Swiss-Prot record, chain B:
Coiled coil segments of this chain: none
GO molecular function, one term: structural constituent of ribosome
Phylogenetic placement of the source organism: Eukaryota, Viridiplantae, Streptophyta, Embryophyta, Tracheophyta
A Gene Ontology BP annotation from the UniProt entry: translation
The family this protein is said to belong to: Belongs to the bacterial ribosomal protein bL17 family.
Protein task: Component of the chloroplast ribosome (chloro-ribosome), a dedicated translation machinery responsible for the synthesis of chloroplast genome-encoded proteins, including proteins of the transcription and translation machinery and components of the photosynthetic apparatus.
Main location: plastid
Protein name, per record: Large ribosomal subunit protein bL17c
Assembly information from the UniProt record: Component of the chloroplast large ribosomal subunit (LSU). Mature 70S chloroplast ribosomes of higher plants consist of a small (30S) and a large (50S) subunit. The 30S small subunit contains 1 molecule of ribosomal RNA (16S rRNA) and 24 different proteins. The 50S large subunit contains 3 rRNA molecules (23S, 5S and 4.5S rRNA) and 33 different proteins.
Disulphide-bridged cysteine pairs: none
Keyword Chloroplast found: yes
Signal peptide: none
Cellular compartment(s): Plastid, Chloroplast
From Swiss-Prot, chain D:
Signal sequence bounds: none
InterPro entries: Ribosomal_uL14, Ribosomal_uL14_bac-type, Ribosomal_uL14_CS, Ribosomal_uL14_sf
Subcellular location: Plastid, Chloroplast
Protein's name according to its UniProt entry: Large ribosomal subunit protein uL14c
Any one of the GO CC terms: cytosolic large ribosomal subunit
Described function: Component of the chloroplast ribosome (chloro-ribosome), a dedicated translation machinery responsible for the synthesis of chloroplast genome-encoded proteins, including proteins of the transcription and translation machinery and components of the photosynthetic apparatus.
Family to which the UniProt record says this protein belongs: Belongs to the universal ribosomal protein uL14 family.
Subunit structure: Component of the chloroplast large ribosomal subunit (LSU). Mature 70S chloroplast ribosomes of higher plants consist of a small (30S) and a large (50S) subunit. The 30S small subunit contains 1 molecule of ribosomal RNA (16S rRNA) and 24 different proteins. The 50S large subunit contains 3 rRNA molecules (23S, 5S and 4.5S rRNA) and 33 different proteins.
Biological-process GO terms, alphabetical: translation
Naturally occurring in which organism (per UniProt): Spinacia oleracea (Spinach)
Alphabetically ordered keywords of this record: Chloroplast, Plastid, Ribonucleoprotein, Ribosomal protein, RNA-binding, rRNA-binding
Domain of life of the native organism: Eukaryota
Swiss-Prot record, chain E:
Primary localisation category: plastid
Name used for this protein in its record: Large ribosomal subunit protein bL32c
Gene Ontology CC annotation, any one: large ribosomal subunit
Protein family per UniProt: Belongs to the bacterial ribosomal protein bL32 family.
GO MF entry, a single one: structural constituent of ribosome
Role this protein plays: Component of the chloroplast ribosome (chloro-ribosome), a dedicated translation machinery responsible for the synthesis of chloroplast genome-encoded proteins, including proteins of the transcription and translation machinery and components of the photosynthetic apparatus.
Domain of life, per lineage: Eukaryota
Gene Ontology biological-process entries: translation
Subcellular location: Plastid, Chloroplast
Regions annotated as coiled coil: none
UniProtKB/Swiss-Prot annotation, chain F:
Top-level lineage group: Eukaryota
GO CC, one annotated term: ribosome
Source species of the chain: Spinacia oleracea (Spinach)
Pfam families: Ribosomal_L36
Record's protein name: Large ribosomal subunit protein bL36c
Keyword ATP-binding: no
Family named by the database record: Belongs to the bacterial ribosomal protein bL36 family.
Gene Ontology biological process terms in this record: translation
Taxonomic classification: Eukaryota, Viridiplantae, Streptophyta, Embryophyta, Tracheophyta
SUPFAM superfamilies from the UniProt entry: Ribosomal protein L36
Record localization: Plastid, Chloroplast
Keywords: Chloroplast, Plastid, Ribonucleoprotein, Ribosomal protein
MF term (GO), any: structural constituent of ribosome
RNA sequence: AAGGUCACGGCGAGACGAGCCGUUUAUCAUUACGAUAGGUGUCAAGUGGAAGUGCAGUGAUGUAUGCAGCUGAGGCAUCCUAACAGACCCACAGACUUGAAC
RNA sequence: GGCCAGUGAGACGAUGGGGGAUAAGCUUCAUCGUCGAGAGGGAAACAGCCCGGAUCACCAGCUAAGGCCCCUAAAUGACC
RNA sequence: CUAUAACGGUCCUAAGGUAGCGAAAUUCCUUGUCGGGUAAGUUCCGACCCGCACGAAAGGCGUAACGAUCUGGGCACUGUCUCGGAGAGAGGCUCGGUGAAAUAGACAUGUCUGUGAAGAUGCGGACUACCUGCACCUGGACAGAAAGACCCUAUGAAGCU
RNA sequence: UUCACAUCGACGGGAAGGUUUGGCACCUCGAUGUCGGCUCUUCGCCACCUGGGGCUGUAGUAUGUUCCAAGGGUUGGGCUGUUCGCCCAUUAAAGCGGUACGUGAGCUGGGUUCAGAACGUCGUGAGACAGUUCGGUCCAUAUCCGGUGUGGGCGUUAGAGCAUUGAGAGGACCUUUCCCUAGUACGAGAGGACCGGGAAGGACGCACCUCUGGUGUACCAGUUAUCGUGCCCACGGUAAACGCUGGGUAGCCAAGUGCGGAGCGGAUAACUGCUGAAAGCAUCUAAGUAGUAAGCCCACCCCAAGAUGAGUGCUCUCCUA
């Protein structure tokens, strides 16, 4: 349950905003490819919960299959790629018919949370996944960087599940929390936000207000 | 991880890879059409586009860098007398990567380089 | 996890935990585990074979 | 970055020359001592006409460092040596004339080091 | 490292048939390439 | 508190009360406030 | 059939499978989509003054051309090259039984 | 008596004791029961505890030890 | 004055340790006590001598030079370390060829807990697990080796005294 | 100072645990590899700290002892092979143990002190010491279970593309100074609060490369030796997998940069209670009920219907003979 509808935007590099007091803050720059049109609302009557379903990245019709574009043309909106809802408490007033919601709702709310696919690092070891220590690099040692002991002795007879092994590190989404908003641009369709979003410039990014 | 490392390294070390690039683009400029593997094909594509457009502006500095890159002496001087008369107005894209059957003994994906 | 915590949280796991240890837990009690239909509400959504009420032989309930 | 086996030069004329600093106080990291962190120094060598001799545990203040110093104004200050001031726990040193320049953020806790300094940048 | 016992006919016919089914998957690709190698304007196979 | 598991009621006003299963001893002096066995 | 898979051009994804983004009269015009990768043309950017010539110097060398010359893993533009040619899987109201109204 | 073998490492349980620390599934003896060499049933499983001594068949019945809510056969049996 | 023994008597031997050394490659107590070095020193050096159990060719005490000798400390120096990080090769991963080995009763080869020749995937109760691969890691299978070098038995074997 | 029970408790007694040394010799010697360290767990509470409370010979600060509570933490070093232990600087505190040294099919030293040698002592001697010192090979491609990731098949009762609910499971829920209140309560002074806020830290975690850098064998720049490009210039090769250096874009990384640890949310453990009876007095309880713990659950971030109980919602397609 979220405390309100959010938007989604793409990361476009990082820079530094110079505050007129004299400080230098590192900000991430957020663009918006297409407006976050509310496509499908799911209320308490026809569904077990209440959520507002928006989308993103208007595309060519060849890029989008028949169930997708049939679902989007059921709402009478543009064919678009990305599609996510926000679960919201039952006080909502949202029509699914082409609500091109403008981005003014976050500037006075100087706290926002963001979610995104972090950059994947592939099958990485235990020295960087779970912040282990390496063995002795010298003094006749042989267990350089290795995983060390894995379990206890005879009495378990196995290893505990969830034990810290090497595996695929990045690729899942994360949410970093309470990130204070900064100078929006009402003509450059760009929002400064002081922090570090998950991922390189180009990826999708959930931008939804806080849950404290 | 290889995020954004856009060098195309082969199954050979660095200086041997440089010699493979120079020799194979040299004999590519000698015969025109050539049989490579596909990694060697794209690795020829970047450098031989650099060597067609290098002696496109036939000065002395371009001719000396171009003679420094290519092995054979008499093929650089057969190049700038040929590339403005042929590959003017093309503005990039000097090759073609026509693929063929894999190689007997390796199942190596084998390609074939033109000049067009 | 205590009894009042399930009965506040998910009550239809109470009886479902009581009768699952009453049936022979092999391949066949697992098949007749699905015959149990426990619902927390006052009304069940079944109109299958006009379900007649269950006959009791227990004088101490 | 001041490890617990570094050599810091002296920034005053208290009576020492350099010091092996030992195991910082305050910031419990103790493998990264930035500016303003007091250190439990021991005297590696000293001036032999002063009541500060060899092998004497003392408390000092890291005032210069080869590691950088992130400021909010955008500047980054760094030195070429490491320096400490032989300090007492009640503020002021027991050496008056401070050698070398210091920064100005440590004025908010160590004002006597700034007031006795030749340059405050 | 040293195997404690041996495998059955069961598990071996499973693993060998996964190996040969992995050989099955790389010939409908060869049927597609052999079918595109036939009469048609394709800019490959000089 | 005193977990003296077996001492008798010792002041002249050590009333003896079983609350919540356990046996405790109360008195006017807070020295004698005990939870027995 | 809808939808996938192979192939194809790759990736900020990745041991292999995966995943993701393309797969071309690859806009036309009044205002967000039909540039995937390479090359090319420019712009950030790195090293930092290239060759050749002239001048000064006996010569090492310095100086003007000239923030020039190379690099261009990054941004934008550009269809010049390769996205051609295909192939294959999945089809044909989704068993049996009760209740409700039509 | 004739011919002719094994065995001579025992184990636990009750009683009578010694060694121990009246400690050990400990050690050594004396009488006995079981296992050894004993299947079946009860003991959740489980050599020595209880019933019990397996020639074999039956899609026969009555019982010992022990049990009669369900898993799992028989009482959600009766009265204090 | 507290001591300690220059000195004395007695017993037994063949004689009762001389110079020098001395918590030592020798000291059990012991990390003896003091001093140096160190912020801190069971290691080191310099001393005292209470030498379990030094000692004069099984030589004793010294020392220049020497040592892939042992050991204590210091300067310079650095990933040894704090505390890791990046890059290049040969492997590892994939494809095509060739293609073993140790091991192996058959394996339809879960976890807890209990029992049992007293440390169970195999027995009991419960819980958890769709089948089957690939890449890593090695906790268990009392994993592989190899009829335990240690301990004991053999009216064994052998060397040596 | 009076005073057994604020705190110790003599003379004695009763238990629990299996972490020391022991006793038995029950599994294992056709092989169960001891002690210490590194790496990496997980668990117990007999609690060192953090959270709540009682009592105090508790005026306040700080305590002494004890109850609930194991979520989290429990430093860096000199000596020694060391466990233990001593010492230094501290810290909120520097807990004790189980998991066959927990962990040598993950890794290395003293040792079951192996083979050489030396000192003391014992022995006539060969040799020996639960005495000392120097040197002294440690193997390995995972079959299965187990684990971490990642698929493919089939199922989910037509076949799909998305979108999510969340059963269940993980991670995070940690902690310290400084300031206001306030030099206020308290105390003759000296000292110096509880409670409620703020700010700066520490470890841990999730991210990122805008700045500062490390690397960067894409790169460019200086230079040595030499061989080629006919020769001068200028370049190319080699000096392993950069000849040695000087810097660096994009990646990766931290030492750098942001963020997190929230809840007059629910029920409780110890405790304080409110009415309040069994004994017309009483008592936290026997009926009902209130405050309240870093503990439990939920909320928090992610995965998640193979949750076979296989969910819910929207949309596309089943044609010809």
């Amino acid at each position: 349950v979220d405390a309100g509808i959010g938007v989604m935007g793409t990361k476009l590099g990082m820079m530094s905003f110079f505050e007129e007091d004299g400080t230098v803050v590192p900000v991430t720059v957020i663009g918006f490819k297409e407006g976050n049109i509310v496509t499908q609302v799911k209320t308490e009557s026809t569904d077990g919960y209440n959520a507002v379903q928006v989308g993103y990245e208007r595309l060519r019709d060849r890029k989008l299959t028949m169930p997708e574009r049939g679902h989007l043309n059921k709402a009478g909106v543009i064919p678009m790629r990305h599609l996510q809802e926000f679960r919201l408490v039952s006080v909502d007033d949202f029509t699914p018919s082409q609500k091109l919601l403008f981005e003014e709702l976050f500037k006075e709310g100087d706290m926002v949370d963001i979610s995104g696919t972090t950059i994947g690092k592939g099958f990485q070891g235990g020295i960087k996944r779970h912040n282990f220590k390496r063995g002795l690099m010298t003094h006749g040692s042989k267990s350089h960087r290795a995983l060390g002991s894995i379990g206890a002795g005879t009495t378990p007879g196995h290893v505990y599940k969830g034990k810290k092994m090497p595996g695929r590190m990045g690729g899942t989404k994360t949410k970093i929390r309470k990130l204070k908003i900064m100078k929006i641009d009402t003509d450059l369709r760009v929002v400064m936000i002081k922090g570090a979003v998950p991922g390189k410039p180009g990826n999708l990014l959930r931008l939804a207000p806080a849950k404290i | 991880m290889k995020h954004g490392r856009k060098i195309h390294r082969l199954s050979r070390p660095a200086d041997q890879r440089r010699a493979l690039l120079r020799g194979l683009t040299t004999q590519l400029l000698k015969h025109g059409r050539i049989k490579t593997t596909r990694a060697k094909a794209s690795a020829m594509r970047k450098y031989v586009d650099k060597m067609i457009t290098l002696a496109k502006e036939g000065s002395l500095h371009k001719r000396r860098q171009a003679l420094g890159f290519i092995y054979e002496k008499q093929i650089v001087h057969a190049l700038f007398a040929e590339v403005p008369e042929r590959y003017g107005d093309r503005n990039g894209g000097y090759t073609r990567i026509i693929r063929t059957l894999p190689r007997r003994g390796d199942n190596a994906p084998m390609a074939y380089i033109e000049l067009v | 996890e205590t009894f009042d915590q399930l009965q506040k949280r998910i009550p239809e796991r109470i009886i479902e935990h009581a009768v699952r240890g009453m049936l022979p837990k092999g391949r066949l009690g697992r098949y007749l585990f699905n015959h149990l239909k426990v619902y927390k509400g006052a009304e069940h959504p079944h109109q299958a074979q006009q379900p007649i009420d269950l006959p009791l032989r227990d004088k101490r309930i | 970055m001041i490890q617990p086996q570094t050599h810091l030069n002296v920034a005053d004329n208290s009576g020492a020359r350099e010091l092996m600093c030992i195991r910082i106080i305050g910031a419990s990291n103790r493998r990264y001592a930035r500016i303003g962190d007091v250190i439990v120094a021991v005297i590696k060598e000293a001036i032999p006409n002063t009541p500060l001799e060899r092998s004497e545990v003392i408390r000092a203040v890291v005032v210069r460092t080869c590691k950088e110093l992130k400021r909010d104004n955008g500047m980054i200050i760094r030195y070429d040596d490491n320096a400490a001031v032989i300090i007492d726990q009640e503020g002021n040193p027991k050496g008056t004339r401070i050698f070398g320049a210091i920064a100005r953020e440590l004025r908010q806790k160590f004002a006597k080091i700034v007031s006795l300094a030749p340059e405050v940048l | 490292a040293v195997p404690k016992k041996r495998t059955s006919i069961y598990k071996k016919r499973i693993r060998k048939n996964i190996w040969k089914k992995k050989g099955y998957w790389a010939a409908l690709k060869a049927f597609s390439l052999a079918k595109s190698l036939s009469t048609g304007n394709s800019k490959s196979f000089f | 508190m005193k977990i003296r598991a077996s001492v008798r009621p010792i002041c002249e006003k050590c009333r003896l009360i079983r609350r919540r299963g356990r046996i405790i001893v109360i008195c006017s002096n807070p020295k004698h406030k005990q939870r027995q066995g």
